[PDB]
Design a protein around this ligand. Structure first.
Ligand SMILES: [Ca+2]
Ligand SMILES: [Fe+3]
Ligand SMILES: [Fe+3]
Ligand SMILES: [Fe+3]
Ligand SMILES: [Fe+3]
Ligand SMILES: [Fe+3]
Ligand SMILES: [Fe+3]
Ligand SMILES: [Fe+3]
Ligand SMILES: [Fe+3]
Ligand SMILES: [Fe+3]
Ligand SMILES: [Fe+3]
Lengths: 153, 151, 151, 151, 165, 151, 152, 151, 151, 151, 151, 151
């Protein structure tokens, strides 16, 4: 049932990235406070990057003979990420920490994806997860730096 | 302008679901015409997303609170999603896109109507511009399908 | 279309003063956030100048004579200028911009209304487009300032 | 000219003839100003062609059938063509272009009126945008000619 | 008295010199543009999304020949046709009313027939200009013929046929 | 004008007024040559605006406070404005621009001299570069007008 | 030392050269509905193939190796077989030929991945992995046009 | 290929002198039309330099030795230069350019004939291309001057 | 080589082998000048490939069947390939490229002649344009090697 | 010209150390403002590197021998480096950059002086241009820091 | 991650000295080949700076503290620098870059191995990509020098 | 500003002849290094042409009359031309380029000194900029030739 878990983790990523995109969009829209003018457009950049991973991962899953999740209901039910109603009263520091938590989870997911693909010998999938992990971890450093903190990976 | 705000938020939900449906069509497509229509879904998706950000931004500007979770999109949208299926024909998939766009154009007409009544002329333009392009796509998709636009 | 011509000319004056005020904010700005907001004023200035040229030139096209001297701009504009002062806070400078933009959005509503009354739909569109972008800026500035747009 | 479809198709014919007259001006031009105005006709021609495809597209989208033969253009257009002549002056050629543009601006107003009555807001916008640009060119051309726009 | 005014039929249609073939091209390219625009607007059926915009590209290329040829005619001291009446009457291409019910296969075949005609006209122009020693005009016709011939190959290929020039 | 800071502020006011004058010329221009000279006015305005922001930043950098209201620009400038008039000829308009430019060039020479004497070599450079290009423009405008530059 | 990595790189030099030739044939002899999309697509595929070739050949050179560099060497050492050009081959048949060539290339690149990993040559390993990824994506899209799963 | 080499080298001389004359027109031009025709001379000059370097590297390629000194250019060119004079009218300047161009078009025809006789098809194409463009320019210059091309 | 189709197909084979030989030179190159000449082979390869595709599509267009297998190219080409050798000097490599180019230029002359005889002027120009550029390269390569082009 | 060469060489060392210090600030930066100021350090670094290569190559051109080892940069630079520390506030970091920039502006003033004294006007210009830009940055950095430039 | 951090920081030191050595080569280069190899050094320097910023922000991301002073770079680098000397030949300069690059490639293998052991796959890939390009440069440099890469 | 005008005109002559000499080197070059130095002469030629047009515009702007015939250039230049010779080594060609640039650098110094004396600071800067770039080229050409700049 070849590359069963590589396919499974690719599909887990499809759901998680779909929710991550929704969370980033909420931060983008609901953001208020000093720093808005830099961080609001920054969320657009992050979203575009996340969308990039979604399409690389979902393509790779299809290529491997899988069937990507492709309804909001599948994304919601399969994602390990939780969403809450939007709220303008959240601080900038609080909004950025939420993004850090989302990104820490993605970097962990991508590590799992890297591990599982390596074990099954799916080196193409392995590379996709490694590249994505690398960038997310770099963003974790930068976001944490803004927050006067070490990356603490 | 509670009604203009209401229809803008309705659009946020529907455009969120429409993007998901376009993505499923993009991914699950099989048959002759794949190489043209697969990347065309990406164009439609980018356009849909552009409407999502215009309408969401305008709602925020009017003092509203956009839907901003998958649960809100799914619960509020009037579009129905189904499981992805590689066995759907390319002609059926394009017909599905047409039905989604017919829905959107009708939603944008409603948004036009509501904002026009409230005198919200900026919101009004947004719906009108979107409607124009969606209707143009309907013509092209229907022409590929050997049909009149039948607006 | 005397009213539409009149409001276009009012905008020529007010945009001309708006430009000066934006330039004052750009030059006298001090405080954390300078590096983002200083260049931002140049973007706002370029946009305001775009409205100026096109409103002034619509007025010419309609058989009008636009204000074209500093004296005409000062004496016809309803916006008041004050002496540059480096001790104004970043947050108060942004609030000054918001106040200027609230004024412009309100003026552009008036221009929409009068041109709509007179059936000058070309002039109507010019005001509608300008108002849209100015209102979007009020949302962003107010957000930086920890506040709702409150249009 | 009962409906938007009829006004769009009229525009299809008139824009086709307008293109032809502009091309004649381009080719037969002689006199001081040639080096400016010869390439300017190309810009105008491209602009006229943009209106053509738009208006034709919209007509097809609305379920109509555009005129699509030279006979149909020539017989349905209110514009009148004459034989090319090198002996027409620059200032007379520019005046000929002004008359065509006045005609088109008038036609676009007619399309604006009808689409508004029907509540075809998409078609209404198309005529509005085309009218705005053509009216600006009338100002410039008349200005070259030492004249007010006289819309 | 005053000089008499000759009353005679138009006559001619007589591709005997470079100036004449160029003006014939001016007329035929104008009608060819109209036919291509009809195919573009009225097209329906599978392949629309590729062939619709392809007509726009061909229209652009046709317009390019029109401006090179008509400029060369003016440069040679001629007077290009420049009214829809002169185009329609001088062109050998026949137009019909637009119809949404023509297959892609039939539409592409119509374009092939227009292109074969144009290639043939440009060969005439090449022959006429060469005999004249008008080498600049000769190259305009050669260049246009080459590209139009390449499109015939591709159109024919789409239709599952050899170019059959 | 006692020092570099003073001459820089003088330039802030005069460049503000020169921009306004160039804009009037741009808007009220009529006559053969409009199509070339109308857009040229925009180029000149953009250049003058460039000098304005280089001179006013240098003044701020030097510990000064730039004029930043229309009242100040108008009161301090040696250039005088008159009401717009469509009846001024193209030749008279270009001659007005030449006179503004001759003034600016002379002001920039004074800026050069004062800064040189104070040993402010950065400010000196700014004035030298501005003077170079304004003088090149005088040659070209004079050449259009059939005359020598007569610096 | 790195003998077999060098040998698999050189195998790829040969196979990619013949693959380029086959793609050019498909490009030229193509006929049928879809020509206007697929003809130019072959040029994209040829450019990508050529990219792999210069990459792999010059990694081989960098390793102290000597790339095949004549048509006879390409033709004899390649495992791909060429056939005479024939306009009567259908579009569907042509695309299926390209799939088979790409399936071969993807398997070759797996072999190259495996051999270079066995020899500790991680630079060569990555060249093959990157090339493999994009070829497999193409298989998906070609198969999809042909109404099938990728069937990797 | 003695004759083809000879005429290529003749073109090296004449184009070098033609470049110098164009530059004189560029520099000494005065009168209405300066702003269009002054930079147009730069375009003509670049084109001439292009023919210069096609013809000069074809001669080298053929095993010839191009003139490469001002003495060689001046002595071998059939074009005559006179001292610059600001007093020449714009229309006379353009007349001078047309003369240079008529000469070049005639030389390029000689090039064509000589290379055709000798069977140097590459040199032949170089001349034919240069002749086409120069002759188009004659049409346009003549048209500015209110005249037929009169090739 | 009977006709135009035959010489076009000869060029398909020969260009294919030439590309292979250029690629060998590119890869096996060692010596002073490598950094300029190695990438230069890529330029030459790109150009040869341009000729190949042009010449093959002209052959198809004429109703021919291009060679399209390595066996056909190798057997039909009159160029001979040898095994790659890193010990060949950079100047010997350049000399090998010249020999290939001299061969191509003569093949192109053969194609010119045959197509002219048949009256196939489109094919005639393809060969002429290719010959022109190859001959220009022969000049430059020979110049690098301190020699006349010897064409 | 040995004093100009000595100060050029001084600038080589100081700019090398300046680059290093900016890089530390870039890497070790923490606090609100990071996202703007982190990439800004890269812009400054690139600017510093430009002055470096400029001044080094002027030194070479003048027959000097630039410092070209880290030991020489470190030993000759009057700037002092300390171990990187993440616990420095972003305001302290920016003040640190201001102090490096004041040093550099003062160094460039010395080079202007020495080069003027010796009549090396090329070196003089290099120092002046560099000084202008550093002084502009000091204004902006100070404005971020709520302060006058205090040059 | 103890060793991956250590080897990243070694790279930070080594890349810094490597940039310095390359800059010396760039500056003190003399001999045939200068015009190609002088700018080449700039490309190599840019690439080494890319690895620097990469490796140094991966170290930071991992919770390390990059060397950020010249003293740290010199003291920790395994690469040794010497005074610049114009008498060094091109051959000798290029050989030195080769030795710098061989060292760097070896360090990157070491970094590959350590990160592989520790399972730091992101760091592993940074070293692998950097080693790949360095090794490709070793081939080209060695080819220019007439030798096999001899990795 | 008589001597300022004088030296500008001298430059016009010297740049015109320098251009001719560079073109001779470009065309007659043979030997190793051709592929880099041949196009390099084009870069140098374009730069020389830039100085020509600016010096000649500045002279016009100052009320002078530039030399504008090959006779004037040749008679007024202090540069000497000889017949082109393919037998010259590339090292001897580059040496001739260095001689011409050394001359220009000295001529530019004389222009700097004379304009500085007459207080024409705009002309002064033109010469200073042109001198800096020529001298940098001398450094590079000399380095290729294994020598110091020796200004
Ligand atoms: Ca498993
Ligand atoms: Fe996708
Ligand atoms: Fe947004
Ligand atoms: Fe304007
Ligand atoms: Fe034209
Ligand atoms: Fe390569
Ligand atoms: Fe050249
Ligand atoms: Fe092709
Ligand atoms: Fe450098
Ligand atoms: Fe960085
Ligand atoms: Fe000039």
């Amino acid at each position: 049932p070849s590359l069963a878990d590589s396919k499974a983790v690719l599909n887990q990523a499809v759901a998680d990235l779909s929710v991550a995109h929704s969370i980033l969009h909420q931060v983008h829209w609901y953001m208020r406070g000093r720093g808005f003018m830099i961080w609001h457009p920054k969320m657009d950049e992050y979203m575009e990057e996340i969308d990039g991973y979604l399409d690389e991962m979902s393509e790779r899953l299809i290529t491997l003979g899988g069937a990507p999740f492709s309804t909001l209901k599948e994304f919601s039910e399969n994602s390990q990420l939780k969403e809450v109603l939007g709220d303008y009263n959240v601080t900038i520091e609080e909004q950025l920490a939420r993004v850090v938590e989302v990104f820490r989870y993605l970097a962990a997911l991508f590590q799992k994806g890297f591990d599982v693909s390596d074990e099954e010998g799916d080196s193409v999938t392995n590379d996709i997860f490694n590249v994505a992990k690398a960038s997310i971890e770099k963003h974790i450093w930068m976001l944490q730096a803004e927050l006067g903190q070490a990356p603490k990976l």
